[PDB]
Amino acid sequence: HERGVSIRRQLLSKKLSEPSSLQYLPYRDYNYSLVMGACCENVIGYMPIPVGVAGPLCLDEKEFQVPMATTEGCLVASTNRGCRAIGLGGGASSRVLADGMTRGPVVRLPRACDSAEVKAWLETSEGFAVIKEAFDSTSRFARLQKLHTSIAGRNLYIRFQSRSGDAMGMNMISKGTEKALSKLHEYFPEMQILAVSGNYCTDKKPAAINWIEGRGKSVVCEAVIPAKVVREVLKTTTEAMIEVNINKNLVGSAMAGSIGGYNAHAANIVTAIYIACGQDAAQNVGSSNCITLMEASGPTNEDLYISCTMPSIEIGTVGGGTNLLPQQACLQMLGVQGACKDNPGENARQLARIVCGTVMAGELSLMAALAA
Amino acid sequence: HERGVSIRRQLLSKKLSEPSSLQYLPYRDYNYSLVMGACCENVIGYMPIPVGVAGPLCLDEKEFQVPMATTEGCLVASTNRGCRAIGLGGGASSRVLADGMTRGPVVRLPRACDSAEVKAWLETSEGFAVIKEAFDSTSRFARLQKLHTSIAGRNLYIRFQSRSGDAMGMNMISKGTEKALSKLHEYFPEMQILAVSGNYCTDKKPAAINWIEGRGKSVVCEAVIPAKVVREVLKTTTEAMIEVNINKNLVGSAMAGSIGGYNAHAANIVTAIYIACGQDAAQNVGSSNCITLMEASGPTNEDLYISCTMPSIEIGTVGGGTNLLPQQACLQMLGVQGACKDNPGENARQLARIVCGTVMAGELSLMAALAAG
Amino acid sequence: EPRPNEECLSDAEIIQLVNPAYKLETLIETHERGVSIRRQLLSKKLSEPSSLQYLPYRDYNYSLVMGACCENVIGYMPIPVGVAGPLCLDEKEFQVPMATTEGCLVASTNRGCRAIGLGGGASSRVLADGMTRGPVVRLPRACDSAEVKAWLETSEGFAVIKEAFDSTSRFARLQKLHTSIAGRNLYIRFQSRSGDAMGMNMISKGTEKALSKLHEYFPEMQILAVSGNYCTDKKPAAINWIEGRGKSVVCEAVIPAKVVREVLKTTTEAMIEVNINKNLVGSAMAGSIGGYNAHAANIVTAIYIACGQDAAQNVGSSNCITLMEASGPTNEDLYISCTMPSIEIGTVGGGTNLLPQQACLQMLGVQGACKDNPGENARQLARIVCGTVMAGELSLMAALAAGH
Amino acid sequence: RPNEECLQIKFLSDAEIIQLVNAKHIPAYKLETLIETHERGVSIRRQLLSKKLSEPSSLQYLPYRDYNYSLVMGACCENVIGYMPIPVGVAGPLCLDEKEFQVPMATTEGCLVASTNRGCRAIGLGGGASSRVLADGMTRGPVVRLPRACDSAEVKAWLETSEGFAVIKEAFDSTSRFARLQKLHTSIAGRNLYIRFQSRSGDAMGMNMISKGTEKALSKLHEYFPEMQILAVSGNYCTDKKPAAINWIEGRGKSVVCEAVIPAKVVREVLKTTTEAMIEVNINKNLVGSAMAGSIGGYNAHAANIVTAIYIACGQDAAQNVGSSNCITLMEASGPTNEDLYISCTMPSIEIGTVGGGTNLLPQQACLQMLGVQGACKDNPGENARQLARIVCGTVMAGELSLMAALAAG
């Protein structure tokens, strides 16, 4: 494998204006067996991304050391300060509210009257039952939970929402969708399948549907930071924090015309954790959706109550980049690497809770720096 | 020193539920001098991301070999197929339509009548001059182009837009914003500066303002793919490609309630190039905004015309992750590493054009795969 | 002539005596007199005392208005009503009343109807039906609101809620619950049928009973507002576009090439190019959610005002995506469809209780309740609205394409 | 008389004219051109329509007599069969910018006027409200296409040069003494170019004037770029009568802000609640709730109710309530003990006018006169329309206050 990468590098070198540029791009002593035929093509090396650690993050009575891969200065230090504030506040609590990856194909019928007939059929328990039967027959973990349909004339967009064990689930859900569509075509032979993804999923593009209905894991996290911790650790006050949160995260985002971006920098934390843990970094587009809320709490309204709600965290602990060793090391640091053998899907849910809690730590710290 | 990283890892390991977790996380023989105190803190190692190459991408009469860092199978191969189709079609053309990073702080006055007065003041050629003077004094490259202000009662949101040479510009623009706001405060002492970023920028969150007014570089790219190339390379037809594009990228995205997501997978290409080239990957949120259009072209309407328009590519070739050697290697592969001394900003603009062109190659290929069945 | 107050009648005497204004009917002889007295009192307060000379008020039936549709009444505003049709829809022919002050709107809609008629008519289908109300409640902690969401998601939890909700009316039938969390806040979207009524009052009453029941199981729950903007009523919202509100309807027709050329004065190809670049691409560039159409709001508003609907509901009722494509053997005929997911409409209650508005509803054959099939009149009216919108879209798009 | 002898085409009976129409000799819509009296044409159309209805007497209660159709015909409506009376109520006085207004509201929604009236009372007892017009400019957003994206990029660069803009501005402004092309916002989508023209329009809402200026400006632009194709005078980039982020962010028509402080005592006595309760409802409903619903511009309780009622009463285009209703309502604890209520309403896109369209009808002018803004402001062109926009924003704030208080009360 290594020799093949060396040769490809040599061939590529002939096509560059600055062939000496490759000298600083590492490639030696790396496990390419796990990469080939699976994670990347035309490999010429690897890009090292610095990994820092923030923690301990006291979440649901457990302590986590969160790995973060980034090239942005202050991010890890800031997130670490947020964790500290949460720890001194007795820790954070989280809950997974929903779980289901989606795929939203588009099909078309000769007339809108026909597509309406198909939608009505898909809404009967009998129609759902046969579609679920076809969808689920593709893999052990593919378990269809619900369907959401929407028509545009003779076009019909069908959003399939399904469980997928500990996997992020796109390949699995796509395979299930394809067989369900084949089955639907048997019931409606005049139906033309236009695209397995008609952007109704919605995958890797901002979309109100993900914000409102959720995609992947929907999670909520919360904590109460004592007034003394707000002053001594965050170097500010509860009142200033609340004023910034409302006018930045709520009013500011509204003025900017944001759908799902009611937070300070959830995307920084999501991206850093995703890269470190072998997730699909491009999914930061929808996985970053977040609304951050803050209120005065306690005896004299001097304590800070904070919560972060993320309805569409697209994540997994098996498959894709999580198959690589360095990435598995970071997943193991968190205790969620691979399949949860006793209860499939539990490692992915735990990782989603960790992401939401670290986002909250990051929000706390940046808002405090903005307020101060 | 590297021994610092080794000790941190050792201390860290005793706190883990599986103390051998760190075994496969590499850390040795990496230049931490450029990382320490600049790109990351509490360093325990590095995460290798596979880098593949797609090309040549025939763009504006030049040929590029595009590095892509990803763990997603088929992405590089697919993008490479798109490049091939474009090359056989005579190449692609691109134009940078606008350039300016932004920062949108929020300030507040005692009353809305007062904030309305500040808005009117900032809209006069005189008021703007004073602000522009304070802003531009922070840097040679920081040149304020304009202001867009919005009121929500007594709150005033002010969007500062400025060029920044070849740097992405966040730090530069933020520093200029702070000096400009301090000057503004001299004229309106009752003004309270609530936050240097009031989410009106908008940075790293989806926002209609970035889609409509742009942020960073706004770029358009286009190409015509011959009917023979569509059939032989993309394995489909122009008519099928157009039908999928309209019903997926336009109608589908509209049904999903998308603002800026009128494309197939621009985010895949943007993220892969960003990680390879030392950009801020979290900026994929807004940098991925894209509308992909396709239509029939030629004598018999059998050729495929395609265009991708990206109004908010946040990118740079100097500063941040671009200071690291491996990342500079990828920037050098493209011929855009560092500052362009004779024409400040030209390297960053060229990188933005390359990103838009590679996104178009990726769109072509995925749409063909969707259409082909 | 006005004699002392203790002795007090004439207009001057009542006015002299007054100096509530809004309580004039509960004091004066008839309805028209209370209004007349209200106008005289008001005139004194105007920089221009004779402002009201041309605001009509006489010979109007205020009995149905007082304490039901409007307060502090000083008269009525006449809105011209025109008719467009026949609209050939689902093998029936409709004469559609349109109340507007916008020139060319009725004439243009009438031309669209003509093109549809010559094309063999239009077909429509009601895809969903259910008015909503989205209150916001709060628990002490997010962990508690998460528990409430889960309980509401159980078949037994939803059962008790539905029973309480359904107990408020015979027409009130809870179809589903969409719950959304924001920290310790819980937004609950109740969706239910409501016979032929638009349903706002009915659904609000049912929501109040349902929340009271929910409070029995979760005493720490604080009901913040019966409407937490999650409905969403009278504000643009992605939730209405994606999940629907009121009636979701689709309509379609095929216009022959000859009709496109001779009636619409354009070509199928030009019509399609304008539709894609205006209604799809243009709306996307403007950052629209639900506004993928040319002027659905013009038609919706005109029909609403004529038929006694809540005109303010045009905000969400106007959501529409208009699609056009080539059809037929030669591929030169024009296929058009309009999809409107959130038409908020009714044929009983509110403004539909007034006689002039009932006249327009009767013109369409949908006035009042449908005793044999509850909800059928409201569904028919929704189909008529969608079909008239399509007629209007056809005509405006043709004008834009041909430069008229 | 037979159809033939009826070749006298006020000398024919309604029955004879109806016979001609049924025999296909006359199109029903052209009735006004043949009949020498507007109300008679309305009368005949009603009779023709009756015979087409499943219920022939359904028009009995639709009024049509004694209405001035001369101002309507060939201007405001076609195929007229009568008029629809909408009840008009009054809310006030609205104490705004040291003036007192009696606001007419046309509606069929119970409690609306009473509620708005209560909000006005709270504002009055609080010392009144203040407002400011932040921007003014109607828009039109056509879409044109060039052969290639490289060409559309060139046209965009050209329009951005001071000299390229001057030429376009000259052509645009030549259509009216009230037209003043303030700015151009251009957006590219491949080879398509969307150009948003923005200009003042005196006291008119301005759609007609701005569309005429745009048509002239594009013709001029075509002289410089003959390869350019004008696809549609409106490419939905305006944006007119459809929800759109562009109107929310850049404004359309008049952008206005209004504010007031309601004393704790007034919140209790008039609104029957507390400042704390009202703030909790406002944040969780108008900000958080609207965010959860995926709203762009709908950060308010019921601005659309007030906008629609005033629009119908004053002869505005009611269909424009779609974008004119955009509003963000903010409430904040004010005062020595955080018990007084600060409130503000910001509406960036109020599309309104006091001349032209429905404002040409007499009953509508009566309502505009009640407010003191009817017609053109001779002394300061545009001032009447700006004053009406301020009144709308202030009445919306009164309505928001009252509904939020009712929601907070239970």
Ligand SMILES: CC[C@@H](C)C(=O)O[C@H]1CCC=C2C=C[C@H](C)[C@H](CC[C@@H](O)C[C@@H](O)CC(=O)O)[C@H]21
């Ligand atoms: C308890 C309030 C709700 C449920 C309601 O029925 O109050 C009605 C009846 C009693 C008092 C009222 C006062 C002011 C308003 C005109 C209001 C109806 C407003 C309605 O037309 C729009 C809302 O639905 C928008 C929202 O808040 O989502 C009206």
Ligand SMILES: CC[C@H](C)C(=O)O[C@H]1CCC=C2C=C[C@H](C)[C@H](CC[C@@H](O)C[C@@H](O)CC(=O)O)[C@H]21
């Ligand atoms: C607006 C943030 C200010 C001006 C800034 O430069 O702070 C930097 C330098 C000093 C301290 C910091 C602490 C925490 C963060 C990692 C922060 C950078 C955050 C940035 O990556 C995203 C924001 O721009 C989003 C926003 O608030 O709009 C970072």
Ligand SMILES: CC[C@H](C)C(=O)O[C@H]1CCC=C2C=C[C@H](C)[C@H](CC[C@@H](O)C[C@@H](O)CC(=O)O)[C@H]21
């Ligand atoms: C979505 C298409 C199908 C189902 C799929 O899995 O094809 C995979 C495997 C085979 C070939 C491929 C070629 C090009 C792409 C990199 C593609 C995966 C793209 C994915 O990362 C984002 C899409 O889901 C976006 C969308 O279309 O909504 C990839």
Ligand SMILES: CC[C@H](C)C(=O)O[C@H]1CCC=C2C=C[C@H](C)[C@H](CC[C@@H](O)C[C@@H](O)CC(=O)O)[C@H]21
């Ligand atoms: C938009 C076309 C131009 C500028 C215009 O004035 O045509 C007028 C006059 C001549 C013919 C017409 C035919 C049909 C319509 C009722 C139209 C006015 C439509 C207007 O009320 C909303 C549009 O502006 C929405 C849009 O297309 O963006 C009307």
Ligand SMILES: Nc1ncnc2c1ncn2[C@@H]1O[C@H](COP(=O)(O)OP(=O)(O)O)[C@@H](O)[C@H]1O
């Ligand atoms: N706990 C688990 N959850 C999900 N998939 C699992 C698990 N354990 C093993 N697998 C397997 O791994 C695969 C899922 O990964 P992958 O093929 O990359 O698809 P996806 O894109 O859905 O993650 C399936 O073949 C499945 O059988």
Ligand SMILES: Nc1ncnc2c1ncn2[C@@H]1O[C@H](COP(=O)(O)OP(=O)(O)O)[C@@H](O)[C@H]1O
């Ligand atoms: N029917 C109505 N018409 C107009 N305004 C009303 C009406 N009812 C109430 N209001 C408004 O509400 C305010 C007080 O209402 P409320 O507290 O219910 O007492 P009351 O019974 O005296 O109206 C009044 O000052 C008025 O502005």
